[PDB]
Amino acid sequence: VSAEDKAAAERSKMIDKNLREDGEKARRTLRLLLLGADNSGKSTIVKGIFETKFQVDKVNFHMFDVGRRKWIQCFNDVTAIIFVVDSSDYNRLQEALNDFKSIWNNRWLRTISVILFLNKQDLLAEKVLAGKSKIEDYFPEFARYTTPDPRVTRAKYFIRKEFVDISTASGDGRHICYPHFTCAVDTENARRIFNDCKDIILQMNLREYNLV
Amino acid sequence: LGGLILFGVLGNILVILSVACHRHLHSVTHYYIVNLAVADLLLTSTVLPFSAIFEVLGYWAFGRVFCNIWAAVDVLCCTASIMGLCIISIDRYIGVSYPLRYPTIVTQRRGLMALLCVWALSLVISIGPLFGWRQPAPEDETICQINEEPGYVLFSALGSFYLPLAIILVMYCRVYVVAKRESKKAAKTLGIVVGCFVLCWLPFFLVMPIGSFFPDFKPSETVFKIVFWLGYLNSCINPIIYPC
Amino acid sequence: DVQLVESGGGLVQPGGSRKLSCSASGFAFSSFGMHWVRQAPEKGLEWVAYISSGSGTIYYADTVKGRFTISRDDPKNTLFLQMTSLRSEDTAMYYCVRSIYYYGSSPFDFWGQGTTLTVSSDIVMTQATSSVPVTPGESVSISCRSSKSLLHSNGNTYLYWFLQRPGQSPQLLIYRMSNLASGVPDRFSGSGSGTAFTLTISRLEAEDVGVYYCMQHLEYPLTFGAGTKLEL
Amino acid sequence: IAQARKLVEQLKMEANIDRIKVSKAAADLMAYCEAHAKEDPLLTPVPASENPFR
Amino acid sequence: ELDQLRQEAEQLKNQIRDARKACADATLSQITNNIDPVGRIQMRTRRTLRGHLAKIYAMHWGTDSRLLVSASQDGKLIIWDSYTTNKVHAIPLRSSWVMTCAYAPSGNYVACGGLDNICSIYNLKTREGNVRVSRELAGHTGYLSCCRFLDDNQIVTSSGDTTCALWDIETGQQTTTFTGHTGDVMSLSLAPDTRLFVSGACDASAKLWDVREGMCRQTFTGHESDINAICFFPNGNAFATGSDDATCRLFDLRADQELMTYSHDNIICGITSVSFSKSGRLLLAGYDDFNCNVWDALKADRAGVLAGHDNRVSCLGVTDDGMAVATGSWDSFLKIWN
Ligand SMILES: CNC[C@H](O)c1ccc(O)c(O)c1
């Protein structure tokens, strides 16, 4: 084999060792895809492509937000998709629902759960208390909808029910949306993301072990 | 007879091949799966034809010098298989109870340690008969018999089945509790795994000690042979049931 | 940029001990294989030792095997040669030589400075010429011969040509018998077959006078040729 | 407004490109394919000795 | 004014289509219907290049057809010695998301890019002995999806911002910007003469570009979805495109039309990588259904299959001398076929 073609193999083994070490380091961090839309409040959810890292309970999470038909397949292996939505408005709410439907039924995202983040619920509460804008004008089914201020709770439950109804269409149980409510001054979003990721990983492990 | 041994060997070989055909077998759980498959394949290809020819011919052929090891390789491989089942159960429990801390708890440089400790314990148990801890060998080498020394019997039986059985039961019960907490299919799979392990290994590790310590309650020879082949049946079954 | 300094040397009484240091600066010392090569005061260069990347492989010359130990400190970027029981034949000038090994690499490309040390089968390379008087601007050639064929089954012929100017450390000219080392003028060329190689230079210029060594790298040890000399 | 002008200018420039017959194009493509049939290790089974990848 | 311009554009397009049809008297299938068939080809995995720990996205062969490069989502750009399956180099990447890679013809530089909208060019031959970044081309407002080296200081990059760019590595600025696409430019393929290239975009359009003139010359349509891969014919007067509509198309620069369509009713999966053999008789269509196919470029018939990948095939390349074929995939294993 000669020394020239054996020191090359030794160098290859050193490179393999470094690659294994880097991969073991990378496997301990969960990758989150931060999606949404403009003015949806995705900038302040947690206190080219943009990446952020935050550690809670000695667990490090990486969230990547880009700013989507093609490059989304690059995120085929992310642990979860944090879909931020601004529920304060109603005209663009149908656009957000269409975006969520497109993301959920994506060919390259059929096994990824979505940590839905209904942001700026305080502005939704203010709008529904003022009464100037009526959801029934935008969503005619809201008038026939009732909860399972109480009007704020009815509106919130209606939005969540609409999102979950979109999610459950042809879901097959491989991935489940996890709705949440977050205000601008909220600071418990990290814990919610932590719990959602824990549930996602637990479900993935249970599926792997051929259990439920 | 030999057909079951061939089927088990083929299944173990297929499991071993599939454990390296795809890169998805990079997690420690796949390492444990391939460890169990290797143990079962070694057990089959090293003991099953010899056991079959011993049962058919009815007498030792390779000789007492070459059949004493057959009583040590067999126990080594059986202990390796059972400890592999135990470590698989431990991995599943630590993965389910600590889902997002699994990579930082079960890490390489630690799973390899567990695997090597498993093999070391298996070889330590198997060396017993070759360390002089065996019954006085018969003069006629045409007859080859297992060792029923009470100290060796207790040590091997305990450290090969009872402690692994206890750990498997505890870990799988905790896993079942957690799975039911997060919500039948899981029940069916866990129950069939535990039952196929117990119904195959408990009969032998009950008929052997009862004959070792209570000769009055010693069973017959046909049941002893059935219990002896039950372990080989379990070895063949494991690659069928554990991947799926 | 790339710079290897050496410390140690001096006078050592026979049978003593000495620690030679080679500090690297300006390049990734961790990924470079290192060698110690000695040159007698009035003879050719003698290979002493070799250590791979990460200290995973170590070779010694038969002369100093067992008496010499080689080591490297990657965090400190240092190469250590511990010498014990120094015979009177071990006095020489030692050079620590970098060499990286991959497809297309140029081993022995950069040679460090020299450390003087004064103490109070193998493929042998033959350099028939001992001194070739030449005139500037005239194309000349240097012939080298090997005991065994250096052409490998992979089509790679491991022959190296090194130049040593008077009072200057050696540098690589031609590696693997056909390729030209970087920074060397295109005047030099190498040709030949197994056990018969020729280094042909055209339009010889100034500062080209010096010693030329043909080294084999097929296997170990690394036996240098006697080396020819070009003078005005 | 200028986008439409640029688009129509590009279309006019592209419209003047001479197009040869499809038969001639296919013929020269096939000629190039067949003229190098002896230099294609993939098409003709490569000998084991000549194959660098064992 | 807008209506008049729209009508003029429609008339021009109609006249161009009429001219193209007037130049279509026979078909490539009819022309080569009397040619000798390729037959059965069974390439086998000569080498398997393990070491990636994430999905592989791009792979480019070297000129000597011994070295090769691959990029993976784990931030690793690995340069392999395909002969002995030894990793010559392993370059960490600033951005873990890489969708393209390229190997310089001189073998001195490599290129990579992706969602970071930066084209990183690394200098392989250095005194320091490690692979450092030679240049960071910036200016694209979208992810880079393909890049190809022209010289040591001239590289063509295609991005997702509907524009390609001929750069100048010495100064790091776009010498020329190629505009005219309406969607993301998935792939680009240089021509052997290095005076023209092609670019396939998400609008099912393949545009020919003149590097020197810096202006589009021809536009080819006929695909039903995004064009993922494109490759020039060895002759230089043709190219082939692979698209998400599970079809491959052959276009001729001189004929300016679609000659042959390689597709099968059985296949329903999009093409991710396409490359040509040295003689051009074989078209290597890499699919995302875990296997590649070999098409007779003159009979439009399947010649053989290349299975052995457990995940989606992302990149496919043919050695310059035609010795072997590298096929990467999302399962972190790229194989070599011969
Ligand atoms: C199926 N073969 C079982 C083996 O002979 C065996 C294993 C463990 C023991 O303690 C033992 O007494 C026997």
PDB file of N, CA and C and ligand atoms in Angstrom, chain B residues 43 47 70-71 74-76 78-79 82 125 146-148 152-158 160-161 201 204-205 208 227-232 235, ligand 1:
ATOM      1  N   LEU B  43     -24.848 -17.605  18.648  1.00  0.00           N
ATOM      2  CA  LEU B  43     -25.438 -18.732  19.362  1.00  0.00           C
ATOM      3  C   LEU B  43     -25.872 -19.817  18.389  1.00  0.00           C
ATOM      4  N   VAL B  47     -23.784 -23.293  18.203  1.00  0.00           N
ATOM      5  CA  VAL B  47     -24.325 -24.311  19.099  1.00  0.00           C
ATOM      6  C   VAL B  47     -25.438 -25.139  18.480  1.00  0.00           C
ATOM      7  N   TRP B  70     -18.522 -26.598  24.546  1.00  0.00           N
ATOM      8  CA  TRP B  70     -19.889 -26.483  24.057  1.00  0.00           C
ATOM      9  C   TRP B  70     -20.877 -26.211  25.181  1.00  0.00           C
ATOM     10  N   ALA B  71     -20.523 -26.548  26.419  1.00  0.00           N
ATOM     11  CA  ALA B  71     -21.324 -26.178  27.577  1.00  0.00           C
ATOM     12  C   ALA B  71     -20.984 -24.794  28.109  1.00  0.00           C
ATOM     13  N   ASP B  74     -22.381 -22.143  24.793  1.00  0.00           N
ATOM     14  CA  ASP B  74     -23.837 -22.072  24.820  1.00  0.00           C
ATOM     15  C   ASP B  74     -24.319 -21.110  25.900  1.00  0.00           C
ATOM     16  N   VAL B  75     -23.786 -21.243  27.116  1.00  0.00           N
ATOM     17  CA  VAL B  75     -24.208 -20.358  28.197  1.00  0.00           C
ATOM     18  C   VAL B  75     -23.748 -18.932  27.927  1.00  0.00           C
ATOM     19  N   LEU B  76     -22.556 -18.762  27.349  1.00  0.00           N
ATOM     20  CA  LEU B  76     -22.093 -17.419  27.011  1.00  0.00           C
ATOM     21  C   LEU B  76     -23.058 -16.739  26.052  1.00  0.00           C
ATOM     22  N   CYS B  78     -26.251 -17.539  25.346  1.00  0.00           N
ATOM     23  CA  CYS B  78     -27.571 -17.334  25.937  1.00  0.00           C
ATOM     24  C   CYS B  78     -27.572 -16.141  26.886  1.00  0.00           C
ATOM     25  N   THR B  79     -26.544 -16.032  27.731  1.00  0.00           N
ATOM     26  CA  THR B  79     -26.437 -14.889  28.626  1.00  0.00           C
ATOM     27  C   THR B  79     -26.280 -13.596  27.842  1.00  0.00           C
ATOM     28  N   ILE B  82     -29.758 -12.654  26.561  1.00  0.00           N
ATOM     29  CA  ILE B  82     -30.652 -12.156  27.603  1.00  0.00           C
ATOM     30  C   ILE B  82     -30.212 -10.776  28.080  1.00  0.00           C
ATOM     31  N   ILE B 125     -19.561 -15.117  33.380  1.00  0.00           N
ATOM     32  CA  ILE B 125     -20.446 -16.216  33.754  1.00  0.00           C
ATOM     33  C   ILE B 125     -20.057 -17.492  33.018  1.00  0.00           C
ATOM     34  N   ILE B 146     -24.322 -31.469  31.059  1.00  0.00           N
ATOM     35  CA  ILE B 146     -24.165 -30.144  31.642  1.00  0.00           C
ATOM     36  C   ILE B 146     -23.729 -30.274  33.099  1.00  0.00           C
ATOM     37  N   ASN B 147     -23.233 -29.170  33.650  1.00  0.00           N
ATOM     38  CA  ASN B 147     -22.773 -29.123  35.030  1.00  0.00           C
ATOM     39  C   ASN B 147     -23.892 -28.608  35.924  1.00  0.00           C
ATOM     40  N   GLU B 148     -24.139 -29.314  37.022  1.00  0.00           N
ATOM     41  CA  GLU B 148     -25.189 -28.967  37.968  1.00  0.00           C
ATOM     42  C   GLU B 148     -24.614 -28.709  39.355  1.00  0.00           C
ATOM     43  N   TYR B 152     -22.462 -23.064  40.997  1.00  0.00           N
ATOM     44  CA  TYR B 152     -22.540 -22.618  39.613  1.00  0.00           C
ATOM     45  C   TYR B 152     -23.983 -22.505  39.154  1.00  0.00           C
ATOM     46  N   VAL B 153     -24.836 -23.447  39.559  1.00  0.00           N
ATOM     47  CA  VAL B 153     -26.239 -23.386  39.161  1.00  0.00           C
ATOM     48  C   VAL B 153     -26.869 -22.091  39.652  1.00  0.00           C
ATOM     49  N   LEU B 154     -26.700 -21.782  40.940  1.00  0.00           N
ATOM     50  CA  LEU B 154     -27.300 -20.567  41.480  1.00  0.00           C
ATOM     51  C   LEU B 154     -26.726 -19.331  40.801  1.00  0.00           C
ATOM     52  N   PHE B 155     -25.398 -19.270  40.657  1.00  0.00           N
ATOM     53  CA  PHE B 155     -24.776 -18.088  40.072  1.00  0.00           C
ATOM     54  C   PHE B 155     -25.243 -17.873  38.639  1.00  0.00           C
ATOM     55  N   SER B 156     -25.140 -18.909  37.805  1.00  0.00           N
ATOM     56  CA  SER B 156     -25.506 -18.779  36.401  1.00  0.00           C
ATOM     57  C   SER B 156     -26.986 -18.469  36.249  1.00  0.00           C
ATOM     58  N   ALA B 157     -27.851 -19.244  36.912  1.00  0.00           N
ATOM     59  CA  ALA B 157     -29.285 -19.023  36.777  1.00  0.00           C
ATOM     60  C   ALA B 157     -29.664 -17.613  37.204  1.00  0.00           C
ATOM     61  N   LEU B 158     -29.246 -17.205  38.408  1.00  0.00           N
ATOM     62  CA  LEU B 158     -29.559 -15.866  38.885  1.00  0.00           C
ATOM     63  C   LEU B 158     -29.052 -14.811  37.912  1.00  0.00           C
ATOM     64  N   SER B 160     -27.991 -14.771  34.992  1.00  0.00           N
ATOM     65  CA  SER B 160     -28.317 -14.848  33.578  1.00  0.00           C
ATOM     66  C   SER B 160     -29.792 -14.640  33.292  1.00  0.00           C
ATOM     67  N   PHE B 161     -30.682 -15.002  34.213  1.00  0.00           N
ATOM     68  CA  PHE B 161     -32.104 -14.822  33.965  1.00  0.00           C
ATOM     69  C   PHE B 161     -32.773 -13.900  34.970  1.00  0.00           C
ATOM     70  N   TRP B 201     -37.751 -18.451  28.327  1.00  0.00           N
ATOM     71  CA  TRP B 201     -36.592 -18.605  29.202  1.00  0.00           C
ATOM     72  C   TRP B 201     -36.932 -19.087  30.607  1.00  0.00           C
ATOM     73  N   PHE B 204     -36.894 -23.093  31.297  1.00  0.00           N
ATOM     74  CA  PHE B 204     -35.590 -23.722  31.472  1.00  0.00           C
ATOM     75  C   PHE B 204     -34.981 -23.352  32.819  1.00  0.00           C
ATOM     76  N   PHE B 205     -35.017 -22.069  33.170  1.00  0.00           N
ATOM     77  CA  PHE B 205     -34.467 -21.599  34.433  1.00  0.00           C
ATOM     78  C   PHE B 205     -35.352 -21.931  35.621  1.00  0.00           C
ATOM     79  N   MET B 208     -34.255 -26.362  35.526  1.00  0.00           N
ATOM     80  CA  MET B 208     -32.869 -26.674  35.853  1.00  0.00           C
ATOM     81  C   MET B 208     -32.617 -26.544  37.355  1.00  0.00           C
ATOM     82  N   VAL B 227     -37.268 -27.666  27.297  1.00  0.00           N
ATOM     83  CA  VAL B 227     -36.829 -26.411  27.898  1.00  0.00           C
ATOM     84  C   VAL B 227     -35.478 -25.991  27.334  1.00  0.00           C
ATOM     85  N   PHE B 228     -34.610 -26.962  27.044  1.00  0.00           N
ATOM     86  CA  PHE B 228     -33.311 -26.653  26.457  1.00  0.00           C
ATOM     87  C   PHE B 228     -33.465 -26.016  25.082  1.00  0.00           C
ATOM     88  N   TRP B 229     -34.376 -26.542  24.265  1.00  0.00           N
ATOM     89  CA  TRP B 229     -34.620 -25.974  22.944  1.00  0.00           C
ATOM     90  C   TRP B 229     -35.464 -24.706  22.996  1.00  0.00           C
ATOM     91  N   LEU B 230     -36.125 -24.439  24.124  1.00  0.00           N
ATOM     92  CA  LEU B 230     -36.887 -23.200  24.257  1.00  0.00           C
ATOM     93  C   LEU B 230     -35.984 -21.977  24.148  1.00  0.00           C
ATOM     94  N   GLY B 231     -34.777 -22.050  24.713  1.00  0.00           N
ATOM     95  CA  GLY B 231     -33.850 -20.937  24.590  1.00  0.00           C
ATOM     96  C   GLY B 231     -33.441 -20.674  23.154  1.00  0.00           C
ATOM     97  N   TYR B 232     -33.188 -21.741  22.394  1.00  0.00           N
ATOM     98  CA  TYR B 232     -32.871 -21.580  20.979  1.00  0.00           C
ATOM     99  C   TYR B 232     -34.061 -21.014  20.215  1.00  0.00           C
ATOM    100  N   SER B 235     -34.013 -17.397  20.857  1.00  0.00           N
ATOM    101  CA  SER B 235     -32.943 -16.773  20.090  1.00  0.00           C
ATOM    102  C   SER B 235     -33.364 -16.559  18.643  1.00  0.00           C
TER     103      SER B 235
HETATM  104  C1  LIG F   1     -30.453 -23.041  25.826  1.00  0.00           C
HETATM  105  N1  LIG F   1     -29.130 -23.216  26.428  1.00  0.00           N
HETATM  106  C2  LIG F   1     -29.088 -22.765  27.831  1.00  0.00           C
HETATM  107  C3  LIG F   1     -27.689 -22.910  28.409  1.00  0.00           C
HETATM  108  O1  LIG F   1     -27.337 -24.288  28.366  1.00  0.00           O
HETATM  109  C4  LIG F   1     -27.649 -22.383  29.828  1.00  0.00           C
HETATM  110  C5  LIG F   1     -27.660 -21.017  30.078  1.00  0.00           C
HETATM  111  C6  LIG F   1     -27.625 -20.532  31.373  1.00  0.00           C
HETATM  112  C7  LIG F   1     -27.576 -21.410  32.444  1.00  0.00           C
HETATM  113  O2  LIG F   1     -27.537 -20.951  33.721  1.00  0.00           O
HETATM  114  C8  LIG F   1     -27.563 -22.787  32.204  1.00  0.00           C
HETATM  115  O3  LIG F   1     -27.515 -23.642  33.258  1.00  0.00           O
HETATM  116  C9  LIG F   1     -27.600 -23.263  30.902  1.00  0.00           C
END
